[PDB]
């Protein structure tokens, strides 16, 4: 719209891209070295696994055997982010006409135009 609706969309994208990171951070605790953390018992080093945010991003780069569940988790947490293109914008938008009819493109080629591009992963670098 004219005013504050773009600001609401920006403040919602900035909060939906910070929850899809904590979703992917939860999936990296499914490693067999973390079997003592997922038990029903009190721990002392539990604050070191929730405060380190750069370390969990650094672990996603190297050792590409847990980075296949850190892409599929973002691709499942981004389905609730791509669904914001129906609450925002009128039904007479020329992109939602060509996306719902399946002529050229889809809903993935609209959120990169409007809200955010998403994730970027390559084969090998």
């Amino acid at each position: 719209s004219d005013l504050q609706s773009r600001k609401n969309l920006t403040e919602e994208i900035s909060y939906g891209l910070r929850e899809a990171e904590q979703v992917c951070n939860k999936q990296q605790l499914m490693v067999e070295s973390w079997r003592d953390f997922l038990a029903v018992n009190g721990e002392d080093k539990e604050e070191d696994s929730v405060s380190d945010l750069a370390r969990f991003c650094y672990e996603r780069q190297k050792s590409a055997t847990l980075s296949e569940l850190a892409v599929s988790a973002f691709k499942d947490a981004y389905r609730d982010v791509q669904a914001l293109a129906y609450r925002y914008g009128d039904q007479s938008n020329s992109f939602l006409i060509m996306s719902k009819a399946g002529s050229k493109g889809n809903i993935g080629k609209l959120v990169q135009h409007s809200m955010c591009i998403g994730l970027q992963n390559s084969a090998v670098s």
Binding site: N8, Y15, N25, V50, Y88
Partner: protein
């Protein structure tokens, strides 16, 4: 009036709460919105379609609804349909005169004088909130930066007065609110909200914070509002407002301030050490009840006159203080007349070892104080019977709510998200219960330690406690009971430690030279283990005939449950026997060092009843609603004809429990008396007419004449394979089921056979099961073991369920064997872990209301998950696995059977709906001169002794202590039937003890049989003729204590 929360229908999703309020404050007035809240499906970035808003007053809501009714409230091209929804997001009263903002609050115990009450501490300004819709009064107390909430509901308020502080003529400055139980102390522990105050708090429960336990000793709240004379009309909503002008005098009472955690205790620290414990126990019990104030309990002259006078003449002054209903303000006035009236007008230990009548001490622990009651008659236990000297050392400690209810899962271990996964955060009440389980209650010159708890005391949490004296301690009696170091799992060890605490009697000590081993018989197949021999023993006939005469039965018991030290199970009786104690392999529980012969149930036949799960399970096997209504009709005709006729009164009384061929009211009707001629049996049968109707409107309780309640048994030889038992009633098509049935698979129909050889064995109400072939009958029928339990049979031609089904896997999970031994700390952490995450009646309640609401009963995908979870919810005492009652299974509505006013009661249409509507249309239909002096001296001695049972428990007129059923229930007894079943037991034991004392008085009053027959005529004349009506009440129980010889007058006057 009702509320102020108004739910908006559909606000647009691209709108924050700082934009909708700018529109709501445009059509309406300025700053008229208290708080607005929009629910989010995600955490902070996905709002839903609707939203909630709470206005300031009622006229703004009535204007906003009239504006929304004409479709004139258009916001962002979206109409708003304002509707009512009872949510109450902020519990605040919508009234400018009921919202106090500054009021001084003090606490303290009630007055020992007329108008001079003391105070412990005083808060400098609280926020008093008087709610009307939710019957509670809040108190917001600020202290050291923390916010505390004191909630006083309208049920504990018993009196409301107005006080005077300044001293002018007829001025209104303060108010005095009386309490009897105590409040609940909360604690405020920490884009779409507009709460314009301090908010986003979490009101979780906590312990006492007022210094060192200054709240639980008060039970009285004083409010001093500066206005006073204007808000006298809004205080009429408070219950029992006294129209009186009370004075006030501030007295400092800091001597009574204690420092321990158990309050209010009688501070007998300056009185010395030469004080009896039995006086201090009653003086502590009379303080928790609102009878004696705290300054009168610590007076020097009353303790001086109590100690300068003998003990048997001291207990009679303390037991008579319960006769006064109101608060007795003059403490010496009730003693100076009692000490002059006692001079004109042994059994403590003689009733423990002979007829098992003990005088135990009970106690209730509220989250803010403690509540002691006094001595009460109860069935003695074997663990108490050997220690006849330490009967004043045993003590039952219950842990209940401040309103004496069950502790919910909201006070202990409140849920809070921390990191990725949630974890239960423990509160202060949990650490208080753990601390009082570690240390114990220290009252008088002694303390108390943890002893044990049985498997029937986890539900309805209670703790047996011992004083740990210098002779025996809390560990010496447990070492005498056996050894519990071998069991490493704490859940099984906690059940094995208290298995000797059941009600049982000892007959004869059996040594260890008469023990013969018996091997186990397995019928296991396809990897699933079964046991045909599960706690089955064999006994000799001579010692069985000995223990039958020792216990006091007519015939020999064919099967009876026994506890030979650590053993537990039932014993079968054969003919060719040579030993007494012959236990099987599945009988060891711990090291059986103790040698006893404790029995709990003999061989007797009760008539078969019905359960609501039985009627709910038989209605989905191919049986319609055909014979249930006919059986209920022929039940209701006999229950409506028993109040008028005599044979109809004798038919149902001989079929119901409590009149097993020997009763007081049965032999009265044996002569042929009219049920309405005398005013005693009429009022005796008046409550018996409505007892079965109350059991028909709450439970089902359908009388089934075909069948007999019988105990399980097993034959050692084995001839029958997949056959039923030849029963003995004082055939075929029998249906065998136990009580905890939820699956549709454990229905079992058998066929009885006539055997020409079983008449020599003598099996009387004992079902025989096969012990070979495939899976056995009772182990696949609701998981019932082969021990002593109940069984329901019917050789009737009414139901006959001809639809069997193989049940699911009844195997449990792996036992949680600990690595180290049990060091007495993992037992308390398991006992407090039973108050939370324990849904036993909840699963059965949610399963019973789910079959009537959905088609294909007990076969859908939702009805099977509850039946699977019920196998784990009942096995908490064996394996430590929680029930974990999930969401999306409660139907959020209840039918018209239980009648809970919280959920909306929909109109039911099922087998139980026509079963309830048929009964519900039938409630609106309906020595003649030588014994005068002895009877005149015994009638008052019976009457004033019967008042001590009358007004101690809350009987109505005469029948609530005679028959044991209560007419008017209480708050803590209308929903807890498990405690009511033990209350009606100890009422009947007390009136039976009074009848035994009257029979003992009868033996010291007659020497001739003609005098024994003529005493009943005079004892009938004193209480039946209207010329001897005194000022007090004349109870209709005087010719029933000697009622055996009273029937001979009517048998002699006929001839």
């Amino acid at each position: 009036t009702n509320r102020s929360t108004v739910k908006i229908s559909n606000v647009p999703q691209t709108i924050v709460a700082d934009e909708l309020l700018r529109f709501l404050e445009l059509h309406l007035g300025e700053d008229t919105v208290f708080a607005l809240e929009i629910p989010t499906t995600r955490d902070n970035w996905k709002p839903r379609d609707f939203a909630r808003v709470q206005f300031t007053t009622l006229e703004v809501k009535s204007r906003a609804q009239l504006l929304s009714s004409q479709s004139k409230l258009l916001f962002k091209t979206h109409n708003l349909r304002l509707s009512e929804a009872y949510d109450d997001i902020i519990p605040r009263p919508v009234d400018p005169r009921k919202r106090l903002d500054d009021i001084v609050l003090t606490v303290g115990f009630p007055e020992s004088d007329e108008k001079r009450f003391c105070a412990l501490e005083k808060w400098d300004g609280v926020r008093c909130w008087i709610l009307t819709e939710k019957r509670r009064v809040e108190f917001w107390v600020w202290e050291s930066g923390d916010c505390y909430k004191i909630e006083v509901r309208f049920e504990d308020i018993i009196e409301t007065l107005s006080c005077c502080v300044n001293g002018d003529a007829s001025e209104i400055d303060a108010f005095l609110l009386k309490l009897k139980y105590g409040p609940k102390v909360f604690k405020r522990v920490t884009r779409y909200r507009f709460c314009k105050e301090d908010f986003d708090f979490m009101w979780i429960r906590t312990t006492d914070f007022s210094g060192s336990k200054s709240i639980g000793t008060s039970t009285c709240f004083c409010l001093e509002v500066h206005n006073g004379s204007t808000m006298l009309d809004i205080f009429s909503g408070l219950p029992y407002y006294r129209e009186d002008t009370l004075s006030l005098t501030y007295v400092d009472g800091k001597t009574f301030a204690s420092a321990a955690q158990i309050v209010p205790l009688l501070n007998a620290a300056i009185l010395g050490l030469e004080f009896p414990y039995e006086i201090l126990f009653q003086l502590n019990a009379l303080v928790h009840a609102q009878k004696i104030s705290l300054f009168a309990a610590s007076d020097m002259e009353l303790i001086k006159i109590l100690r300068g006078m003998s003990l048997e003449t001291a207990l009679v002054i303390l037991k008579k203080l319960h006769q006064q209903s109101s608060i007795c303000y003059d403490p010496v006035f009730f003693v100076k007349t009692q000490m002059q009236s006692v001079v004109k007008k042994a059994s403590a230990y003689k009733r423990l070892t002979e007829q098992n009548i003990m005088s135990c001490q009970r106690a209730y622990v509220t989250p803010s104080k403690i509540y002691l009651l006094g001595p009460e008659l109860e069935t003695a236990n074997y663990v108490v019977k050997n220690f006849a000297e330490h009967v004043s050392d045993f003590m039952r400690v219950t842990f209940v709510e401040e309103d004496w209810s069950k502790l919910p899962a909201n006070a202990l271990s409140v849920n809070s998200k921390e990191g990725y996964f949630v974890k239960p955060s423990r509160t202060n009440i949990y650490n208080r219960v753990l601390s009082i389980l570690g240390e114990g209650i220290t009252v008088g010159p002694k303390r108390f330690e943890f002893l044990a708890f049985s498997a029937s005391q986890l539900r309805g949490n209670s703790v047996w406690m011992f004083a740990s004296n210098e002779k025996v301690k809390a560990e010496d009696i447990r070492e005498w009971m056996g050894c519990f170091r071998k069991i490493r799992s704490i859940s099984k060890c906690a059940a094995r430690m208290g298995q000797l605490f059941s009600a049982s009697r000892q007959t004869l000590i059996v040594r260890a030279q008469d023990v013969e081993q018996i091997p186990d018989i397995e019928v296991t197949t396809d990897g699933a283990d079964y046991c045909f021999s599960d706690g089955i023993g064999k006994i000799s006939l001579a010692f069985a005939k000995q223990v039958a005469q020792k216990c006091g039965l007519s015939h020999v018991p064919s099967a009876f449950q026994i506890r030979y030290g650590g053993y537990k199970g039932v014993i079968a009786v054969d003919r060719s026997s040579f030993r007494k104690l012959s236990l099987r392999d599945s009988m060891l529980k711990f090291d059986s060092n103790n040698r006893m012969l404790n029995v709990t149930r003999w061989t007797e036949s009760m008539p078969c009843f019905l359960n609501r799960e039985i009627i709910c399970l038989l209605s989905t096997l191919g049986i319609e609603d055909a014979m249930f209504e006919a059986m209920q009709a022929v039940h209701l005709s006999m229950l409506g004809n028993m109040l008028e006729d005599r044979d109809a009164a004798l038919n149902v009384l001989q079929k119901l429990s409590g009149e097993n061929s020997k009763n007081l009211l049965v032999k009265m009707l044996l002569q042929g008396y009219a049920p309405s001629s005398e005013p005693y049996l009429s009022m005796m049968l008046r409550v018996h007419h409505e007892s079965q109707l109350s059991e028909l409107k709450s439970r089902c309780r359908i009388l089934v004449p075909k069948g007999r309640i019988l105990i399980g048994c097993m034959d050692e030889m084995g001839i029958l394979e997949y056959g039923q038992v030849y029963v003995r009633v004082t055939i075929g098509k029998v249906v065998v089921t136990k009580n905890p049935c939820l699956h549709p698979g454990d229905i079992r129909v058998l066929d009885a056979i006539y055997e020409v050889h079983f008449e020599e064995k003598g099996y009387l109400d004992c079902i025989i099961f096969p012990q070979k072939g495939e899976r056995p009958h009772p182990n696949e029928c609701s998981g019932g073991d082969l021990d002593g339990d109940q069984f329901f049979v019917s050789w009737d031609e009414k139901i006959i369920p001809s639809e069997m089904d193989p049940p699911m896997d009844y195997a449990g999970s792996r036992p949680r064997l600990m690595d180290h031994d049990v060091t007495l700390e993992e037992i308390h952490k398991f006992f407090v872990d039973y108050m939370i995450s324990d849904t036993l009646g909840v699963i059965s309640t949610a399963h019973l209301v789910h079959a009537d609401r959905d088609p294909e009963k007990a076969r859908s995908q939702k009805c099977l998950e509850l039946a699977n979870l019920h196998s784990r919810a009942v096995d908490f005492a064996k394996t430590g696995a929680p029930a974990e009652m999930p969401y999306a299974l409660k139907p959020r509505e209840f039918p018209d059977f239980l009648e809970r006013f919280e959920k909306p009661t929909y109109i039911s249409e099922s087998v139980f709906g026509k079963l309830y509507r048929a009964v519900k249309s039938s409630l609106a239909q309906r020595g003649f001169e030588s014994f005068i002096e002895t009877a005149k001296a015994h009638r008052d001695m019976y009457g004033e002794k019967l008042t001590s049972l009358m007004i101690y428990y809350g009987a109505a007129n005469e029948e609530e202590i005679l028959t044991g059923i209560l007419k008017t229930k209480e708050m803590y007894l209308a929903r807890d039937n498990r405690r009511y079943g033990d209350m009606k037991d100890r009422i009947t034991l007390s009136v039976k003890d009074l009848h035994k004392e009257a029979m003992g008085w009868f033996e010291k009053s007659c020497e001739d049989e003609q005098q024994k027959k003529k005493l009943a005529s005079a004892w009938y004349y004193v209480t039946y003729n209207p010329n001897h009506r005194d000022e007090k009440l004349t109870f209709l129980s005087f010719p029933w204590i000697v009622g055996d010889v009273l029937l001979d007058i009517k048998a002699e006057n006929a001839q």
